[PDB]
Structure 1
Amino acid sequence: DMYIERAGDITWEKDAEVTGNSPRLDVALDESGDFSLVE
């Protein structure tokens, strides 16, 4: 049995840890809602 606890407000935070890249990926989405790479 599953329960929820509040974790914060939903706010844009000016001066937050900027990171990660921006890949363009060829993908397929199956009937189970699973993504996969089309190569």
Structure 2
Amino acid sequence: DMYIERAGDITWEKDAEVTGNSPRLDVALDESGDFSLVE
């Protein structure tokens, strides 16, 4: 049996850690909701 616990508020925080690149990927989505790369 699964249960839920509060983890916080949903708000934008100014001065947050800015990280991560922005890649353009060619992807496919199957009937099972699974993404896969196409090259």
- The CA distance in 2 between the partners of 1:3 and 1:10, in whole Å, is 20
What's the TM-score once normalised by structure 1's chain length? Answer: 0.98
Listed as ranges, the gaps of 5+ residues in structure 1 are none
What's the TM-score once normalised by structure 2's chain length? Answer: 0.98
- The CA distance in 2 between the partners of 1:21 and 1:32, in whole Å, is 27
Give the drift of 1:19.
Answer: 0.1
Once the two structures are superposed, residues 11-32 of structure 1 have per-residue CA deviations (whole angstroms, 9 ceiling, x without a partner) of: 0000000000000000000000
- In the alignment of these two chains, the number of paired residues is 39
- Kindly report structure 1 stretches of 4+ aligned residues shifted beyond 6 Å: none
Listed as ranges, the gaps of 5+ residues in structure 2 are none
Query: Percent identical across equivalent pairs?
Result: 100
